Amino acid sequence: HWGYGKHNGPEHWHKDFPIAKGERQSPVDIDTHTAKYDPSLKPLSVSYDQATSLRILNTGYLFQVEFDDSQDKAVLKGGPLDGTYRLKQFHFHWGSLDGQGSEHTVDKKKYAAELHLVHWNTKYGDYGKAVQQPDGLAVLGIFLKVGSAKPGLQKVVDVLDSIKTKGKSADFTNFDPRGLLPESLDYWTYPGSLTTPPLTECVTWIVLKEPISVSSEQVLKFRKLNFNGEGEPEELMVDNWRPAQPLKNRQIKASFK
Ligand SMILES: CCCSc1c(F)c(F)c(S(N)(=O)=O)c(F)c1F
Ligand SMILES: CCCSc1c(F)c(F)c(S(N)(=O)=O)c(F)c1F
Ligand SMILES: [Zn+2]
């Protein structure tokens, strides 16, 4: 199966998922000097006041926190989006070293990790339909740098030892994703794709300019997870990021400056 290694990593994915070589692949390098300020973009509206987390899961590729998306609770709207997108899950990608781990880059700068909050377009009724459509998903991306601890991340960090291996889950209720946001909602936006197979071109990317700070100890705990399942040989879950893909004809828009 696909993964992040020499044998089955990003450079191999095209053989099972030919859209890997498509015209709107993600992530990309964000060249801050060619991005266009767009005074017509709206401020993002991130409404997470009624978010209901359910569960945290080690998928064998990453870990994800899942939300009850059976009602209009936690929604993203505004900015470049038409309509209303419902929060389904967040997850992270991270490095073996603090020097790498993010999927998007900024003027070629790699961050230690990248948080993705995945939302689906409620015009399509549910996630499984939405992920098939060109404007099905909106993913909010937030860079992590290593520095001061992020207090709102600690509840996540502390549960990871209960989901060390592929397929493990744990109840994860009452987690507030507002704790993971930076102060500023200034963003870049561009049309792209899932960054993991099946690499579908269904994503409007919204990448915040301001990183959040996490401690060395918090990211260290991400790196103790395992790609493998229980009772299989230990492979640390590190470097689960796809490198930047060709921008092709696309324009990155900035909400600011
Ligand atoms: C023997 C186990 C690895 S075989 C393999 C593979 F090499 C891939 F590149 C892929 S891919 N194109 O999905 O990365 C794959 F699914 C595989 F099963
Ligand atoms: C694979 C599709 C099922 S889960 C998923 C996803 F929805 C994403 F948007 C992304 S991402 N990285 O494009 O936000 C992701 F990595 C995922 F694993
Ligand atoms: Zn992701």
Swiss-Prot record:
At which residues is there a site annotated Involved in the binding of some activators, including histamine and L-histidine? Q89
Q: What is the effect of changing E114Q?
A: Strongly reduced activity and sulfonamide affinity
Residues the record lists as binding Zn(2+): H91, H93, H116
pH-related activity info reads:
Optimum pH is 6-8.
Q: What is the effect of changing T195 to S/V?
A: Reduced activity
EC numbers on record: 4.2.1.1, 4.2.1.69
MF terms in GO? arylesterase activity; carbonate dehydratase activity; cyanamide hydratase activity; zinc ion binding
Instruction: Give the reaction(s) catalysed.
Output: hydrogencarbonate + H(+) = CO2 + H2O; urea = cyanamide + H2O
Keyword terms: Acetylation, Cell membrane, Cytoplasm, Disease variant, Lyase, Membrane, Metal-binding, Osteopetrosis, Phosphoprotein, Zinc
Q: A Pfam family this protein belongs to? A: Carb_anhydrase
Give every Alpha-carbonic anhydrase domain span.
1-256
> What mutagenesis or variant effect is reported for H116 to D/N/Q?
Reduced activity
GO BP terms, alphabetized: angiotensin-activated signaling pathway; carbon dioxide transport; morphogenesis of an epithelium; neuron cellular homeostasis; positive regulation of cellular pH reduction; positive regulation of dipeptide transmembrane transport; positive regulation of synaptic transmission, GABAergic; regulation of chloride transport
A single GO CC term, please? Answer: myelin sheath
Summarize the disease involvement recorded for this protein: Osteopetrosis, autosomal recessive 3: A rare genetic disease characterized by abnormally dense bone, due to defective resorption of immature bone. Osteopetrosis occurs in two forms: a severe autosomal recessive form occurring in utero, infancy, or childhood, and a benign autosomal dominant form occurring in adolescence or adulthood. Recessive osteopetrosis commonly manifests in early infancy with macrocephaly, feeding difficulties, evolving blindness and deafness, bone marrow failure, severe anemia, and hepatosplenomegaly.
- Subunit arrangement? Interacts with SLC4A4. Interaction with SLC4A7 regulates SLC4A7 transporter activity. Interacts with SLC26A6 isoform 4 (via C-terminus cytoplasmic domain).
The UniProt function text for this chain reads:
Catalyzes the reversible hydration of carbon dioxide. Can also hydrate cyanamide to urea. Stimulates the chloride-bicarbonate exchange activity of SLC26A6. Essential for bone resorption and osteoclast differentiation. Involved in the regulation of fluid secretion into the anterior chamber of the eye. Contributes to intracellular pH regulation in the duodenal upper villous epithelium during proton-coupled peptide absorption.
Please report the name of this protein according to its UniProt entry. Carbonic anhydrase 2
What is the name of the gene encoding this protein?
Answer: CA2
